[PDB]
Amino acid sequence: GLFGAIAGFIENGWEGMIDGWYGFRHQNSEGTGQAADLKSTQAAFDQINGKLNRVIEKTNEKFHQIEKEFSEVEGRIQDLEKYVEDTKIDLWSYNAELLVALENQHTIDLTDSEMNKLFEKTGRQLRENAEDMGNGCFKIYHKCDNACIESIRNGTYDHDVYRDEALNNRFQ
Amino acid sequence: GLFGAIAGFIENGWEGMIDGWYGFRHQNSEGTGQAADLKSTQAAFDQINGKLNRVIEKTNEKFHQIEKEFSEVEGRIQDLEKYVEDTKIDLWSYNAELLVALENQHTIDLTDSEMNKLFEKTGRQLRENAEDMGNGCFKIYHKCDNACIESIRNGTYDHDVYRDEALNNRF
Amino acid sequence: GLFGAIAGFIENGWEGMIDGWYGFRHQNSEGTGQAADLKSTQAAFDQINGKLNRVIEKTNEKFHQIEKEFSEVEGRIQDLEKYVEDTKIDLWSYNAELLVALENQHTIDLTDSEMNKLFEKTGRQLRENAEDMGNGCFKIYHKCDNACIESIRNGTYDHDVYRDEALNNRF
Amino acid sequence: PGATLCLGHHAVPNGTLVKTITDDQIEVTNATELVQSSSTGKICNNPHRILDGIDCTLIDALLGDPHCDVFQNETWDLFVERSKAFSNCYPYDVPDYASLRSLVASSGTLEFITEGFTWTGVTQNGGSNACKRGPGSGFFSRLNWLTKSGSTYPVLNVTMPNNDNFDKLYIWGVHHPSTNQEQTSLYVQASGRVTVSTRRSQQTIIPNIGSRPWVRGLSSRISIYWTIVKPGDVLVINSNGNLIAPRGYFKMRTGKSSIMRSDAPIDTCISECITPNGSIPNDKPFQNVNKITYGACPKYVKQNTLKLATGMRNVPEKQTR
Amino acid sequence: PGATLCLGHHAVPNGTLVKTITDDQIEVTNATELVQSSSTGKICNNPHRILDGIDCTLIDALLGDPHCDVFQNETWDLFVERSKAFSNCYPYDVPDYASLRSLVASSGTLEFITEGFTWTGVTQNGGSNACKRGPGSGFFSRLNWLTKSGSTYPVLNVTMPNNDNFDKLYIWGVHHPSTNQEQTSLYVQASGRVTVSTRRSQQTIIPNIGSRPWVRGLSSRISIYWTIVKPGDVLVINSNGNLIAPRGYFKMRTGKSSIMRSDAPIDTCISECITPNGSIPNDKPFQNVNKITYGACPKYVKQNTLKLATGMRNVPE
Amino acid sequence: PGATLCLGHHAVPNGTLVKTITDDQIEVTNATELVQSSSTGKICNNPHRILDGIDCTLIDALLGDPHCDVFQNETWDLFVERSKAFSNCYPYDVPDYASLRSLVASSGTLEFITEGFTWTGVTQNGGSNACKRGPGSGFFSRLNWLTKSGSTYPVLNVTMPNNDNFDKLYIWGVHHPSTNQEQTSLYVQASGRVTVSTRRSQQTIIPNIGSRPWVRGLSSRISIYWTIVKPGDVLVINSNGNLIAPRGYFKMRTGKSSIMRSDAPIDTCISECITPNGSIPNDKPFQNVNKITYGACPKYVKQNTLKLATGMRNVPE
């Protein structure tokens, strides 16, 4: 995708993450764990759901039309009836093909975008207390217990608290 | 939008900014102020204007066509005339609906993109003399008078001048 | 484009780069040079090639149809035959115009994106050993011989090796 | 000793292939089908009024072929004509059959109002053994076969004004005998003529004597014609022989009525969309079941499947297996 | 002592809702309307040549119904037929009326060139009290009602070659008497016939005797037919009765001419696009006023509004 | 002393212009053309079976105009009618010419099967000096001009059932004499009639007596009609004069056959797509050569060029 996260700097997805579309894995002094990010997951879902509902917006209801199958050869009028219908069908078939191609490209790009948004949001939260490893992971340069990890995940991590500890670990 | 600036890491817009679409607000020793960024504003406008002009490119002029209202019942020929026209109208109605949906998604994304471009341009200007707070604001780690702010806004800020002062304040 | 690299923070392209679409120019103690990046080039090419093949997917074979030129005036039936055809041609002409506009916007954006992806990949490789000058160039804050440059270009640069040297030069 | 925080996204063991601008096949975590490609094989009896023609075409029900008498005054949203239908009355043709069928189908009713035409000096209610009604000879219920009275068939000249505020459809015919003997025997005059007119239109038909192919014992034919009379206009029928007279008019309406050829059985269920193959659900925007449809239907396309991605790109962990 | 530098964008207190791929309603700072949904109610007389039919249909002006004499030789880009139009001449029908109307409308002219047909042995210039011209009986100006001379109506057999470099349109007819008495009285022969042909095509019409309903005093009728003669071809007219003869031909043209049914008044103004509801502006790409249009017009769509975003997402304070 | 590492992209000194959503013209490094705008000027004889009509229209070949006798055994995927084609037999018209031409073109064969119609009490094989065969008079090869035998022309009444599993096309006609003298001389009765029917439909044609323009010595005409008989149905022909009888039927097929008007020469080459201008390549999705096409063709559009970008934005030095 356009943002280079999904199938990009993030090597692969997690089959083990079954409670959300995007999320966090950590390793600290207390071990390892996984948690889904609800906000990013919800934003992807809302957009995909929105486009689905637009596409299935029921719009057409037709009653008496023209005949489309013929039991007799007739020439000019029947040629025109068949041509009109064949023309219609080709144009709608084109519309359908284009629609799915554009929608699908966009769905892949919007999901890639949401991954990227979450990554940049996290990076900004951490300020000078962490470095981007380049594979979707941050090396955090301080002691970060399970409380500290949850603080990052629920958006309440105060970077000032750990800055001195982290700045020291980073530069020598 | 795709870039996550507008309605994203920037919490909201400024109703007070009436002289541009994007811009700067600052707080320094000398107080606070606001200035529109003309370049980014112009780039967004030029793209939106470009698409508007493509959409209103007058393209059809038609003269004698078929009849589309009928005062008598006739059967087969009239069924076909009505069907041809109804088919045409449904296809053009579809085209119109799709056009606006695609254009609008793209306009929202290109405007979000221009916000993001301005933000990354500013960040790059400041080098090591500032930090990204994460809400669309830079904490600048040195004395930055109104001359210094304007230097950033008009693209002439020399980061080397303040680097020692700023590096010290940060670390 | 949406990413602001091509025709953006990168001032212009390189006419001298004839062996790839994206790449690297360096200056070190040993002089200057140029090398194409294969991976980014390949990703752009594969996507453009993919869309080309979708667009030229042969789809249309028609045999007996309606007459479209007429040597006599006839009125109603001929009016309808001409209208049907004119309607068809306008709709396909619209489809063709829209198709190319959407494809082309997207091609420009995906190529801009690949430039940006390569730039962010390089920046991430360099960690704390370099700074973004803002014009598509990294100032590398350590001795970087031709072996070291190639290490960056082929993805094997170990930033830990030079970190102390580089951190000292920066701060 | 610090901490590592890795950002990621999900993957699923079983993704789906979709098409994009750049790829004809690429794997996403989920997708949904946009083309309806199946039917139950049955036409749902609701919410549209479905009238099963059974053994009868719409035109035979209109004219009043005796085995179609059950359709008198019927109405429909969709008249369904079956491939088993047959005619069993006087052999006939309709010049512009397709148009008469279309306009009646679209009107949605066979509501017939009898009018008191005065046919002075002729015998009414002629019948044929080609069109039995009970044990004896009969005829189309809505048509009146006029023949000589005594040894004369006078010039008939009758009128019916339309003083209603709706349009009247009149169905009438012309008899084409197979021999001169039959002609003069039924109508006296050697050559007949039927002229049916309103203020602004007219149709004159001269019958033609000769054999057509034997159908139910007869080489003669009736040709069927129609005339619409608007409010304030007047019908005049003028004939010196061979007139197959109307008994009245059909009420015309406009609305959502149509006709469909199908052999699918009618069943108790609810479906907005009907095809000749049976009803189809209309939750999807496209369908590949049949280009012939009635009601609120997905649009017909040539593709039998089109997948809309409903999730991200599916990127499993590569394995050394 | 530091500084804070915040990047931002504008918002407005009163945004506009638009549709996207993902949202049926989302708020942007500004939008513009792409569907023209209103008209002035008037047809602008420029830049197209508008000819108001007033009391006349195009066909009545073509045939030369006396109250339509003011339309002789007229030209138009758009002929406007009014619902108040009426016929006031001999009662007639046109088999394929819609085609004759279409082809004349499209030609854009009633330019008529009189030709010297020689009708030997018949009376010319027949008239009727159903078609008064001044105080006395009359007829369609472009048609010539031929009847017997003395006690005979010979076989008429005439020719007119087309030695011009343009196509000629001939309008002619067949008279349908209401009685045998009328037939023989006017044409002698008990049954008439009209055959009109060129090298490559022909029409033969047998009249039909019988009562139609009374229209302007008459139960008889005329049926109107037409024949186009191309450069180098020749017209032949052959009849032993019931011929309503042409007096000449109409010059055919091709171009931008058409016809429209409308009751909108004509006004002095400029508009490229005309609908039956009146002229409409054509700055927008779509319109929902009327599927019937003439000129440089927006395309007809079913939506009555479609908003194109002309600004960013609106996120107010 | 450190190092500088600059990221960049290629450019060329002169790129190609394309259109986007936002710009009518923007320069990219490369593009490819999506509209085919040129032809060789020649129709390739493969892979479609091309039949060049040369001097003959399809209808003249069908009827069996003597100079078209060479087409009798012929089949095609595409019949090519040339502007130099001419008729050289009895002067005729076809009401609904366009339909007969269409249905024969679509059937793709002139395969004709003779049937043993029994025409009791008439003379068969009439010919005319308008349609010369060898030293004498002749006629359309597939039609049988019936005239009186002795001093009588009886009521003809014949039948032919279709017990095959294919549709039969019957071509027949009606003769329109130029005088009453010629009518009674050929057919005895003062007025003829032809009635052709199947179980469920019928056509009755009354001839029309009168002069048409002289064509190859004659003011009389034939009008051509057709009847399709489906498997299990039956043909009946009934006439007391003026019948131009079928000799048999054309065996109909369905498939990919058509007809095209063109003066482009036929050449030995391979092309899937044929236009009247000549064959065109079909590698591109669109074409602006001609709206008339046959085969696997790009779709016709009004644009003469449409460029698909195949590279990035070109930003030269």
Ligand SMILES: *[C@@H]1O[C@H](CO)[C@@H](O[C@@H]2O[C@H](CO)[C@@H](O[C@@H]3O[C@H](CO)[C@@H](O)[C@H](O[C@H]4O[C@H](CO)[C@@H](O)[C@H](O)[C@@H]4O)[C@@H]3O)[C@H](O)[C@H]2NC(C)=O)[C@H](O)[C@H]1NC(C)=O
């Ligand atoms: C004009 O020519 C046609 C064709 O030759 C001719 O029509 C034919 O006439 C005969 C006699 O009416 C038809 O024969 C009938 O065919 C059906 C089978 O499909 C049988 O049911 C009939 O048989 C019964 O009735 C007979 C009494 O007439 C009995 O003799 C017999 O034992 C059976 O009970 C009968 O054979 C024949 O079908 C038609 N064919 C067609 C194609 O129409 C017509 O009569 C000629 N016109 C004139 C005026 O001569």
Ligand SMILES: *[C@@H]1O[C@H](CO)[C@@H](O[C@@H]2O[C@H](CO)[C@@H](O[C@@H]3O[C@H](CO[C@H]4O[C@H](CO)[C@@H](O)[C@H](O)[C@@H]4O)[C@@H](O)[C@H](O)[C@@H]3O)[C@H](O)[C@H]2NC(C)=O)[C@H](O)[C@H]1NC(C)=O
């Ligand atoms: C009814 O009126 C018709 C119209 O006048 C009559 O038709 C005319 O009949 C005569 C013969 O009786 C034809 O004369 C012949 O014409 C050809 C040549 O035809 C054309 O070609 C040459 C050039 O090649 C050109 O110079 C001529 O002017 C012609 O245009 C001559 O070769 C013959 O020798 C002879 O002159 C007329 O052509 C014909 N005209 C038309 C328009 O048909 C018809 O005879 C009348 N019928 C009755 C029953 O009275």
Ligand SMILES: *[C@@H]1O[C@H](CO)[C@@H](O[C@@H]2O[C@H](CO)[C@@H](O[C@@H]3O[C@H](CO)[C@@H](O)[C@H](O)[C@@H]3O)[C@H](O)[C@H]2NC(C)=O)[C@H](O)[C@H]1NC(C)=O
């Ligand atoms: C991935 O996409 C597929 C669609 O392609 C989803 O499958 C659909 O899911 C629901 C079941 O949760 C089904 O709809 C329900 O049907 C029952 C009766 O069948 C009805 O009572 C409910 O009201 C509801 O409509 C649907 O049949 C099913 N369709 C198919 C083709 O499998 C699936 O849910 C998606 N998976 C995820 C994880 O999102």
Ligand SMILES: *[C@@H]1O[C@H](CO)[C@@H](O[C@@H]2O[C@H](CO)[C@@H](O[C@@H]3O[C@H](CO)[C@@H](O)[C@H](O)[C@@H]3O)[C@H](O)[C@H]2NC(C)=O)[C@H](O)[C@H]1NC(C)=O
């Ligand atoms: C065949 O039947 C028709 C219909 O009844 C007859 O037409 C009618 O003819 C009479 C005169 O013979 C018309 O009367 C006239 O009415 C006007 C007022 O409308 C009046 O001012 C005149 O003095 C005159 O009396 C009558 O309108 C007309 N009816 C219709 C409906 O057209 C026809 O004459 C009959 N023909 C024969 C030979 O029986």
Ligand SMILES: *[C@@H]1O[C@H](CO)[C@@H](O[C@@H]2O[C@H](CO)[C@@H](O)[C@H](O)[C@H]2NC(C)=O)[C@H](O)[C@H]1NC(C)=O
């Ligand atoms: C619905 O009915 C139509 C026709 O009645 C079916 O279309 C036929 O499908 C076969 C292939 O299976 C083709 O060979 C025929 O040409 C088609 N016939 C016609 C008349 O188009 C169609 O398959 C049916 N669809 C379903 C879902 O039952």
Ligand SMILES: *[C@@H]1O[C@H](CO)[C@@H](O[C@@H]2O[C@H](CO)[C@@H](O)[C@H](O)[C@H]2NC(C)=O)[C@H](O)[C@H]1NC(C)=O
């Ligand atoms: C333009 O004129 C048309 C034709 O009279 C108007 O359409 C009619 O008006 C309403 C709703 O549009 C319906 O009840 C009628 O059935 C419509 N008739 C037809 C033929 O569509 C239309 O409203 C007018 N539009 C404007 C903007 O004036």
Ligand SMILES: *[C@@H]1O[C@H](CO)[C@@H](O)[C@H](O)[C@H]1NC(C)=O
């Ligand atoms: C940009 O800003 C400075 C500081 O206010 C101003 O004095 C200067 O004139 C501006 N630009 C240039 C190029 O001089």
Ligand SMILES: *[C@@H]1O[C@H](CO)[C@@H](O)[C@H](O)[C@H]1NC(C)=O
């Ligand atoms: C048909 O309807 C009309 C009027 O509504 C009525 O007079 C007539 O008796 C009805 N006939 C039948 C068979 O229902």
Ligand SMILES: *[C@@H]1O[C@H](CO)[C@@H](O)[C@H](O)[C@H]1NC(C)=O
């Ligand atoms: C919308 O459009 C134009 C500017 O192009 C302006 O006149 C109008 O005030 C704008 N409205 C808003 C709310 O910005």
Ligand SMILES: *[C@@H]1O[C@H](CO)[C@@H](O)[C@H](O)[C@H]1NC(C)=O
């Ligand atoms: C009609 O056409 C021309 C004018 O160009 C002329 O022959 C004729 O007299 C004109 N008649 C009228 C009434 O203008």
Ligand SMILES: *[C@@H]1O[C@H](CO)[C@@H](O)[C@H](O)[C@H]1NC(C)=O
């Ligand atoms: C330009 O585009 C075409 C189509 O893909 C390609 O085959 C050709 O080699 C390209 N030319 C250059 C100079 O890149």
Ligand SMILES: *[C@@H]1O[C@H](CO)[C@@H](O)[C@H](O)[C@H]1NC(C)=O
């Ligand atoms: C058509 O085929 C027959 C039988 O094979 C042959 O004798 C005849 O000459 C052929 N006709 C033409 C015009 O080639």
Ligand SMILES: *[C@@H]1O[C@H](CO)[C@@H](O)[C@H](O)[C@H]1NC(C)=O
């Ligand atoms: C093809 O022929 C048409 C019709 O004669 C002509 O107008 C058109 O310009 C031709 N196009 C080309 C590319 O030869």
